[PDB]
Design a protein around this ligand. Structure first.
Ligand SMILES: Nc1nc2c(ncn2[C@@H]2O[C@H](COP(=O)(O)OP(=O)(O)O)[C@@H](OP(=O)(O)OP(=O)(O)O)[C@H]2O)c(=O)[nH]1
Ligand SMILES: [Mg+2]
Lengths: 195, 203
């Protein structure tokens, strides 16, 4: 139709929530088409390898997860979702690989190893310590490792929404991190993606 | 002052890519070959500032970044001239998507083949996987380069993918892997591709 881009998403996927949170922050007019709501034949036409989400424009289509949000940030420049200072931007760009490779797989391990009797219980405890041992390491900044809302916050919000549907909820016990969680969910970009 | 310290190892294709890019940027960097015995003091500091003594690692007074896709980005922030990427978001996305493919298909496997514990049957199946896709990969790199140069004839930027693939070919030969192509022109291009002055200076 008249929408600038069409984002084909899949339910309960952090890579789909990431795109939505960013496309909302940019205020780019988007049409959101949920996966599974398509014909099994068309699902193979949009993405031949069933990799979601998919972002389509008139002349271009992209579904690479490691590079999607970096494209949304460069394609729609304002507002900038990367830090303005060089040293700060060089680090966020590394923490993005850290999050994708160190913290997103643990979500899959909560879905995959939900088949082990007492494995989930051991995993919630490990993830809990990983945070509490980090709520003290990080404090005194509005957003994740920066003064402004960044791509790292989209990565994390999407991860927070998906864990929160798997039973792992962030309580007062995460204090510094819980206040950071309350500010994240207050933003309109993260709010449209949570319902 | 321009402190920049780059941790590397000899005959490491990753360290050869970053060193060549620092050379093209004319950036002030101090190369440290952690393989050499005299540099044992630096290696100790390396296992301190990186989770696994990652190689290579770009170390400054402020940060320590270790992935190739990250290092190339960081280098672009510290030294923008000349630019290594195109100007249009589509082309930049494709260059990134292509860098990931070349890293997982070739760069990661070139490092597996250098393992002294790799079984002979696996090594040979690894070299054949790389031989099936190298030509098709090189054609796409050139394809994206011709598009980006034509879309902005005045931008006059460098194609990092061409720089990375040059080292793939180089390590193909180093490891006795055949570049499967009877095309006379591809051999000429590869021939001139390995003859660029900045590439000789790196080896
Ligand atoms: N030795 C070495 N490896 C590099 C370098 N740059 C990238 N890589 C390796 O290549 C693998 C994937 O590279 P990426 O292109 O970043 O893809 P990814 O983020 O989805 O994992 C990674 O190993 P992996 O098996 O996927 O594990 P992990 O790193 O994702 O934890 C990563 O360690 C480098 O400079 N030196
Ligand atoms: Mg990985």
């Amino acid at each position: 139709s008249n929408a600038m881009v069409t984002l084909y998403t899949t339910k309960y996927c952090p890579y789909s929530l990431r795109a939505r949170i960013a496309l909302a922050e940019k205020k780019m007019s988007t049409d959101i088409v949920e996966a599974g709501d398509l014909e099994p034949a068309m699902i193979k036409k949009i993405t031949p390898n069933g990799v979601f989400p998919v972002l389509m424009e008139k002349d271009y289509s992209i579904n690479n997860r490691k590079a999607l949000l970096i494209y949304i940030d460069e394609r729609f420049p304002a507002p900038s979702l990367l830090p303005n200072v060089v040293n700060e931007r060089i680090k966020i760009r590394l923490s993005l690989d850290k999050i994708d490779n160190e913290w997103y797989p643990v979500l899959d391990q909560i879905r995959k190893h939900r088949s082990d009797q007492k494995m989930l219980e051991s995993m919630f405890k490990d993830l809990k310590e990983s945070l509490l041992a980090m709520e003290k390491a990080f404090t005194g900044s509005e957003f994740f490792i920066s003064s402004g809302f960044t791509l790292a916050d989209c990565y994390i919000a999407a991860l927070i929404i998906c864990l929160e549907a798997e039973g792992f909820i962030i309580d007062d016990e995460y204090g510094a991190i819980y206040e950071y969680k309350k500010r994240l969910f207050a933003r309109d970009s993260v709010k449209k993606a949570n319902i | 002052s321009n402190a920049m310290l780059l941790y590397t190892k000899k005959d490491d294709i990753y360290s050869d890519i970053v060193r060549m890019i620092l050379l093209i940027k004319g950036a002030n960097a101090k190369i440290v070959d952690v393989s050499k015995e005299e540099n044992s003091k630096h290696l100790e500091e390396l296992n301190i500032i990186t989770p696994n003594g990652n190689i290579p690692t770009l170390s400054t007074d402020d940060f320590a970044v270790y992935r190739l896709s990250v290092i190339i980005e960081a280098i672009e922030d510290l030294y923008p001239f000349p630019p290594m990427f195109p100007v249009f978001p589509k082309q930049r996305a494709n260059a990134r998507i292509l860098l990931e493919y070349v890293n997982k298909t070739f760069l990661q496997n070139i490092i597996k083949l250098q393992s002294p514990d790799l079984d002979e049957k696996q090594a040979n199946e690894i070299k054949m996987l790389m031989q099936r896709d190298i030509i098709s990969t090189y054609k796409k790199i050139v394809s994206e380069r011709e598009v980006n140069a034509e879309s902005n004839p005045d931008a006059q930027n460098i194609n990092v993918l061409t720089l990375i693939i040059t080292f793939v070919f180089y390590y193909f030969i180093k490891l006795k892997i055949s570049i499967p192509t009877k095309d006379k022109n591809i051999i000429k291009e590869i021939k001139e591709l390995l003859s660029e002055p900045n590439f000789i200076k790196t080896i």
